Design a protein around this nucleic acid. Structure first.
Lengths: 99, 129, 79, 38, 212
RNA sequence: AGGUGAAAUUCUUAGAUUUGUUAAAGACGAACUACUGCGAAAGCAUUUGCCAAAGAUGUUUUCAUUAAUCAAGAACGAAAGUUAGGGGCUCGAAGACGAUCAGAUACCGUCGUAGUCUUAACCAUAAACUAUGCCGACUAGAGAUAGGAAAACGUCAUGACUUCUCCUGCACCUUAUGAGAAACCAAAGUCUUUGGGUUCUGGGGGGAGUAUGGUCGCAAGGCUGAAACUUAAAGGAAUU
């Protein structure tokens, strides 16, 4: 039986999508079915960054953020607990948890 | 001398498996001090670790005061390229340069990124563990 | 509750051309007055060609997707 | 034959991709042996 | 024991930048055959613009300087090229906008030639309820051609010394934006990166006019 | 230094790995990239120019049944593979050692030939999938979205945005006294209240996509395709 109406790849009127390699696994999955979290984050945590505010040259300084787009394999995600797993009813929701 | 606070770019290469702390002049052609995680600690496991990268930076802090250098521009770096997520050394090494009292300015990420390029290791099905 | 025989003027104006009860065209003709000449010209609302004047060619309208643009201030009266 | 089901694998089985290959090696051998006796 | 053999030299910027100091480096003590000022020649120096300005602005961007000549513990830099920081250009990239790019290889009246790049992002209006917003390729082509023509005209009219001045106030970026509204509004519109392909001749007397 | 779960093979003071500026080489076009577009399907993401071609929309143009579906027959058909020249960076079936293990011809690691890329032929199959043939009619709404078109003393400067209607796309949500074995389904509805037109395929599970014969192929193999004997269950969807 179909576990998803979608199939999990979210592809319509193509026949062929682009491909990406998983950032951890190595695996070629399709770009559409990859599962992607764009992790913006500053370099030195939060607690440790006050050392740089103390130590530095210049009156104030914006500690510049690190921008990366992670892409995952399904199996790499479910192992690493990005997505885990959901019920048959609650599967269908597509919104943002943590807006 | 007359104008205090002379600078030198610092080049924190921090992959997994090892952390490289490198100090050089603004031109960058001539190096001043070089330290590698694994010069401090001799496990192979603990080459990459928070403590080894911290203890690496303390030797760099000591050598920088002697030669001239009172301040540091800094350039963090994951292996990046084909392999782009800087390791557990880069947290601790950048913190360690503060606790010496080198005067920090101007942080950059300079981990090299393609515009789509090459092929990655581990085949189609990937590095199945 | 419904009237297929006598539909409303408001709703059947909105519908497509052919889907109306009696099909008829929403295009029309125009008596155009260009600024120089006192003459008049019968011009279709949707014109596929660049229409010239009755003598010494000026230009009435340039063709577009649907309705043609008329060149600057020049009036037009529907038939 | 089998057609579409071909590889249904509803229950513990050999695996179709391997099965097709095994039969190909048997078949390929049949050829040279039958051409040898000409 | 190794660093007894070296001595410090002082880099000096153009008069255009407004800060004479910034360049500190060591070339090592001279030895007959392979002397110091040969090895010191043709080094390259990526430096932030907000250092040269001396004000906390333009944190983004970097200017590259190579020292053409050396005279008595001083190094006289005419610039090699321009660059933008990866913090800036990656912050500007957001989802549901149209990234436009462009380039031209352009010749100044001064001998050498450059390869400028531009990045422009379409911007939503006020009171716009549309979820995304995009430029219809054809619109993008018109905008792109417009960007190159404007960029080409500016570089060609002004000599390199003059051109660097245009970059500091980021006047060129503003000009492209106000021309292109007729097609699409745009935002940001930076010049991003510049690359010298030639450097025409050395010319000592021309370089001393820059260093006042 | 490398690399790993942890180590080794491997590379290194005849200066590696890291720092910087170049040069050559051949791949690949990141982020923007989406329950978006285009294409008969396979498939197609850098800039600019040239060459034909296509859909939708608009049309008080034109011909006037020229149409639908298709045994034979014909064109295209990813990846791998083949044949003959180029090119050969990275990755890398085979092979090689180094680990792990009771063993490990595997997973992990380090090298690494064919191949990967391109011109000229072949091959003709993929979970080639929407696992739903192709035209047509009618059934039910709401909000999005891509393309075109019309309207508004609309808002900011020919265009962007707002509000509203029309067809044409990929979809999505909600619901049915419609259907179904159920999963689910605007088609799988309008089918025991059984007939709009038409092409192809199936008849318990093996034996078997095998044998033999035919025909296409340079081969690998493709298309067509049995029987003897064997067996009471195979199989589908949900429940505990």
């Amino acid at each position: 039986p179909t576990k998803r109406r979608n199939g999990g790849r979210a592809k319509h009127g193509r026949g062929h999508s682009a491909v990406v390699r998983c950032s951890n696994c190595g695996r070629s999955c399709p770009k559409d079915k990859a599962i992607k979290r764009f992790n913006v984050r500053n370099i030195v945590d939060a607690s440790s960054q006050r050392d740089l505010r103390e130590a530095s040259v210049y009156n104030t300084y914006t500690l510049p953020k690190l921008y990366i787009k992670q892409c995952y394999c399904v199996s790499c995600a479910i192992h690493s607990r990005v997505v885990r797993v959901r019920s048959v009813e609650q599967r269908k929701v597509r919104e943002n948890p943590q807006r | 001398r007359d104008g205090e606070i002379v600078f030198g770019v610092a080049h924190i290469y921090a992959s997994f498996n090892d952390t490289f702390i490198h100090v050089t002049d603004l031109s960058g052609r001539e190096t001043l001090v070089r330290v590698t995680g694994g010069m401090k600690v001799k496990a192979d496991r603990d080459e990459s670790s928070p403590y080894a990268a911290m203890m690496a930076a303390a030797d760099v802090a000591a050598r920088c005061k002697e030669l001239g250098i009172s301040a540091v521009h800094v350039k963090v770096r994951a292996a990046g390229g084909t392999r782009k997520t800087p390791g557990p050394g880069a947290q601790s090494a950048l913190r360690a340069l503060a606790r010496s009292g080198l005067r920090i300015g101007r942080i950059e990420d300079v981990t090299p990124i393609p515009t789509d390029s090459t092929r990655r290791k581990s085949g189609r099905r990937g590095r199945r563990l | 509750e419904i009237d297929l025989l006598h539909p409303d003027p408001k709703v059947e104006a909105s519908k497509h051309k052919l889907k109306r009860l009696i099909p008829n065209p929403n295009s029309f003709f125009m008596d155009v007055k260009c600024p120089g000449c006192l003459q008049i010209t019968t011009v279709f609302s949707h014109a596929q060609t660049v229409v010239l004047c009755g003598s010494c060619n000026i230009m009435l309208c340039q063709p577009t997707g649907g309705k043609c643009k008329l060149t600057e201030g020049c009036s037009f009266r529907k038939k | 034959a089998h057609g579409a089901s071909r590889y249904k694998k509803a229950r513990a089985k050999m695996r179709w991709k391997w099965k097709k290959k095994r039969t190909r090696r048997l078949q390929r051998k049949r050829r040279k042996m039958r051409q040898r006796s000409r | 024991d190794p660093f007894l053999k070296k001595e410090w030299y002082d880099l000096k910027a153009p008069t255009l930048f407004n800060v004479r100091n910034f360049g500190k480096t060591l070339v090592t003590k001279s030895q007959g055959t392979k002397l110091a000022v040969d090895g010191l020649r043709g080094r390259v120096y990526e430096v932030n613009l907000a250092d040269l300005n001396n004000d906390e602005d333009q944190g983004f961007r970097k200017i590259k300087l190579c020292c053409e000549d050396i005279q008595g513990r001083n190094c006289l830099t005419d610039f090699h090229g321009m660059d933008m920081t990866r913090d800036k250009i990656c912050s500007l990239v957001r989802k549901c906008h149209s990234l436009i790019e462009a380039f031209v290889d352009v010749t100044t009246l001064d001998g050498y030639t450059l390869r400028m790049f531009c990045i422009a992002f379409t911007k939503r209006r006020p009171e716009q309820v549309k979820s995304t917003c995009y430029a219809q390729t054809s619109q993008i082509r018109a905008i792109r051609k417009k960007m190159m023509t404007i960029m080409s005209a500016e570089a060609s009219k002004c000599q390199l010394r003059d051109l660097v001045k245009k970059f500091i106030p980021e006047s060129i970026g503003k000009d492209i934006e106000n021309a292109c509204k007729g097609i699409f509004p745009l935002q940001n519109v930076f010049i991003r990166k510049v690359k010298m392909l030639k450097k025409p001749k050395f010319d000592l007397t021309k370089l001393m006019e820059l260093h006042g």
